[PDB]
Symmetry: C5
Subunit: 206 residues, 5 copies
């Protein structure tokens, strides 16, 4: 465990071996989850990159938050993928927040505290329990077979993952930087492993 | 009766069977009405959709607030239709408020608290009392014959309908989220029926 | 006399018979005047319309505040006309204020409290005393021969006319909605006559 | 002497005989000066006009603040001219402030309190003492030979001229309308002479 | 030593002999540095210019902050150069802040307090101790062989250089104009030498 408050990872060079593995104390497969994180990059107008990858022993794209070039944000669960239109992108640190529910398939997507429309995706699906979380790289296998074109260059931090669906007030509290208590993945009790050219530097965002 | 405060309906998938029927304790035909609601959708730049439909045993488009593609908002009463120009539409939850009066035909249209110009429509007409209110679908019969192209995908809530014309101060109070007391259709005493893939989730708008 | 505070006229339908005559207790011909009013319309991007007409037994366009299509505001006195450039027009209630002086010919034109440049028009001219004030229609005779293309569709109110030139501080007070005391045409002591399809409804502007 | 506070000159008609001569109690030739004034006009997008002319018995353009069409502001001293780029001009009263120093040639140009870059012009030059200051007209002789195309149409006021270089804090105080004490040309002790169609009206700017 | 607070250098004319040499009490070669300065110029849309040059007896571009025409800011260390994209440049005084670290190669670039993305440059390199700092001119030798096309025209000041990497809070304090204590190059204890047409005038920026 490590209290990584006011600190973030740094991926300064485009490569295929720089990544960070996040360990989660999960035993029960998830019927709902909410992933909130913060990242900063300049490749939004050059190519596509991976933000948050989550793969199991059966699917390499179980939970993947991808950025599609000239399209926007790509949120996929269980292989199927929905798109969130982004007309104009700005060069600034952005805070994203994704949520999902199996009983209804509703997917919520929040950008800088402003929520987007609700869409249906994988109603009744069951997300596996054991997985390998990788930040900065998209995995097309179990913890390997990385990708120089789908890799991420920039900063990332404040990664928090719950096991239920957060309310709008709770998401606003997350965005405002208040107090919270994650249970699946906590930025204050992270169990991470660094492999490659990844440095830990103070965050640039307030 | 159900107190649906801080809660809204969810139409996540485009279909023709997802709808919600609103029951109203009306006995006298309306000589004036004021409909205030709140919705959120992304189809404003893709196609047209229905927002608030109100049909009787004689006219399927008695009171219909429609969104015309590349045109704007469409408010029709008794079959005749007037148009409200919308040059640029934004991706954000919007609060609309419509009012009508039979003695003078004046139609008031408010967007996010900002009022539009006053137009004449159906002077002296009489709106029927018994009706079938449907949210998310445009009806071209009495409570049926739905429409995959005129259906609505997104959220909707705060539906309030009076039996008279509201003042500008009252409409500003409605927009500010203060206290009010509807008499024909109250979001705090709604008598609704869900049929299809419609879920009740907390509202995204403040 | 009628106290029409917080109330305005409504011209909802384009026609040639809807108008309102304003009576003024004037006996002396005016050597200077200041006309402040408020209106709201959507025809600024479709065609031209009349705002404030003032005609005598000799000239039908003695004092006329006209809106020229794709040009801007048209202020004419005694037949001669000057133009005020409007590059971009917005769909919103606007408050105009015009002033004139015979001893120097200076014409002041204020839009939403922001003053425009001062221009010369009819130095030494004398405006007649008896006249027929018409709102919503441009007259090309004495109180008649109306015009479906030069008519006005929308709301209008807060019409106040003095017999001298107002100061910038006084015009700012007028725009802020403070206290004042007109002497030629008072919105609080208006002597008006309605003929046609003109309704009196509460104002939309604050 | 005349206290012209909260008052400004008016040039409403384009002509060649409307001008105002400003007398200055100067005896020593100036080694440095600072000219701050305020004007309002609409010809910024039509043609060029003169703002502040200052000529002696040897040079008609000794000190001239000119507006070049589709270029910007033109500040010239002793015949040589430098340019200040203006990409977009707005229709609003603007406050300009120019300063010069002979020992170093530095020229400071302030627009609405925002300073521009410093440029070199006429290092070591000596500005004459006796001169004829003319507002609204550019002179190409000593107090004559005016110019219908280089004339000015609009308002002008708050003309203040010192005999040294003002500091940034002093220029900010000038822009904020605080207290000051000019010595060469004071708007509170102006000694002016009106010849032509020039009227004294209250200022439009706050 | 000289306390140059609220004062800045002036390069008003484009030439090749106007420059200022900054002396630094450095003995140990730098493993990390942070350079914060403030400048103002208008050549951002005309050509390229030099901002902060730092050369030793072996490399003329050891530390150079350059502005590339139609590209943006150019930060180079040890000969290798990285680019920071600038889509739109404005005519206003800007505050830049650069930092570097040899142990990790991370380069931080701050514009007006807003940080940019972190990039890798010269991991493990060692910057020499003795050097010749020149402001306004880019050197392609040791303190000579200047360049009329790479020279700088405008103002510059608040030059501060440390011997370590500053934190985001410290950089925000620098931008806010608070108290600080540099150790390699202090604007309050500068040891500078002027050669050419360079004047010391009060700063324009607040
Ligand atoms: Ca994969
Ligand atoms: Ca892949
Ligand atoms: Ca129908
Ligand atoms: Ca239909
Ligand atoms: Ca006429
Ligand atoms: Ca006519
Ligand atoms: Ca001349
Ligand atoms: Ca000339
Ligand atoms: Ca070099
Ligand atoms: Ca060079």
């Amino acid at each position: 465990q490590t209290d990584m408050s006011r600190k973030a990872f740094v991926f300064p060079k485009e490569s295929d071996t720089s990544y960070v593995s996040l360990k989660a104390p999960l035993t029960k497969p998830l019927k709902a989850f909410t992933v909130c994180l913060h990242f900063y990059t300049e490749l939004s107008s050059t190519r596509g990159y991976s933000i948050f990858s989550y793969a199991t022993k059966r699917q390499d794209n179980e939970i993947l938050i991808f950025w599609s070039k000239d399209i926007g944000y790509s949120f996929t669960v269980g292989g199927s993928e929905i798109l969130f239109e982004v007309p104009e992108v700005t060069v600034a640190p952005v805070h994203i927040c994704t949520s999902w529910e199996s009983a209804s398939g509703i997917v919520e997507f929040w950008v800088d505290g402003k929520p987007r429309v609700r869409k249906s995706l994988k109603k009744g699906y069951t997300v596996g329990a054991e997985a390998s979380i990788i930040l900065g790289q998209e995995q097309d296998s179990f913890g390997g077979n990385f990708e120089g074109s789908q890799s991420l260059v920039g900063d990332i931090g404040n990664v928090n993952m719950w096991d239920f669906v957060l309310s709008p007030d709770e998401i606003n509290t997350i965005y405002l930087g208040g107090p919270f208590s994650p249970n699946v993945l906590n930025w204050r009790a992270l169990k991470y492993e660094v492999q490659g050219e990844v440095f830990t530097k103070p965050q640039l965002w307030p």
